[PDB]
Amino acid sequence: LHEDRLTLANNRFAISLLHNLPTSTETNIFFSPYSISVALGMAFAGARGETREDLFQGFGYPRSDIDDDAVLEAYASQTRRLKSLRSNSTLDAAIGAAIHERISLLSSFEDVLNNSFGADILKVDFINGGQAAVDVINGWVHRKTRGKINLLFGEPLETIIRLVLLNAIYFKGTWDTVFDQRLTTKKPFMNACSTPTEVDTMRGEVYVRHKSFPLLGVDIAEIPYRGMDYSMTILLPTRIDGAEVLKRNITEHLLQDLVKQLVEQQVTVYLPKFKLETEYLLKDHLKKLGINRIFGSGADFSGITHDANLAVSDVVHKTVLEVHEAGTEAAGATGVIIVAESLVESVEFRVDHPFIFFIRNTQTKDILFVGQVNHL
Ligand code: NI
């Protein structure tokens, strides 16, 4: 029951992280608060005492009415729910703890990583097997994401590292209404550096949930995937330069109030065929949110090992997305609806300047992906 609780904690975490991640006119943001949260659950499973209480507080489980004795079981229920509701859309996740092979592991940690997180444990030799370790990890992410994410590490890791938390995830899905490839054309997209660039721009008279919010300087359109259980929610600033103010203004509560008011409507969508590929070493950003002890000397990890001084070296996150006429995949759909011109009115939603977006499960309300596009 109260499945909303971990979802709220994760979605609040999503917005905190979006507020704090590095931004520039030249840099795009793209991350899974869902996969990063599962990764912080692995840390929670292993930490005890003040190391665990510090993570508990810093992530904010108690602010969403989750007692610490209920965290692992809330992950377990969210885990079973996402991969047991049958769906046209799929998530391929690489979630694991890479631990020095010569640390003895408590069986309970193994059991919790399995049932709570569907997480793997990669025992590797971080001291002597430097290149073999990254070869193993990189092979693991490659197979877990079915060739979408193929490297977590281009170089051996520092020989000091004993525990590193990995989370890569790929979303696959098809538009409920596929765009007609014959209508895709080169169109200007105004980057955040205020130079226009020419990009493949999809065009469709497409049923979406839409509302204009001129007072908040945002137009919003929710573009559903097939099955209606997933969507891409695009927040397009009224001002060409409005993205940083919009991102600062957005909160988990406000986003929920805005999405509720969207009305089903046929709109002319202009959507660049954009591509994102991002990696984060998240330790410093997590420190800034009050998560510190899990990364420190004298971190209590008597949940993982009764016989070594473990600290988490880092939380390594990597993800990737392409937009196509069919959805996530190039030529992933072969049927199409050729729409007659409307003769009464058609709203335009033209994504031709920096914008923010969320891929959500519309039933559970989980935010799977947060995006900011400053630059194509
Ligand atoms: Ni409200």
Author numbering: 1 to 376
What does the study report here?
The structure of native Iripin-4 was solved at 2.3 Å resolution and the crystal belonged to space group P3121 (No. The crystal contained one molecule in the asymmetric unit with 51.33% solvent content and a Matthews coefficient of 2.53 Å3 Da−1. The crystal structure has a tentatively assigned nickel cation (Ni2+) located between two molecules of Iripin-4 with crystallographic symmetry that interacts with His253 and Asp257 of both molecules.
Iripin-4, one of the many salivary serpins from Ixodes ricinus ticks with an as-yet unexplained function, crystallized in two different structural conformations, namely the native partially relaxed state and the cleaved serpin. To inhibit the target protease, serpins undergo a fundamental conformational change that leads to inactivation of both the protease and the serpin itself. The amino acids in the RCL, particularly the residues at the P1 and P1′ positions, determine the protease selectivity of serpins by mimicking the substrate of the target protease. However, Iripin-4 was shown to inhibit only granzyme B protease, as no other protease tested was confirmed to be inhibited.
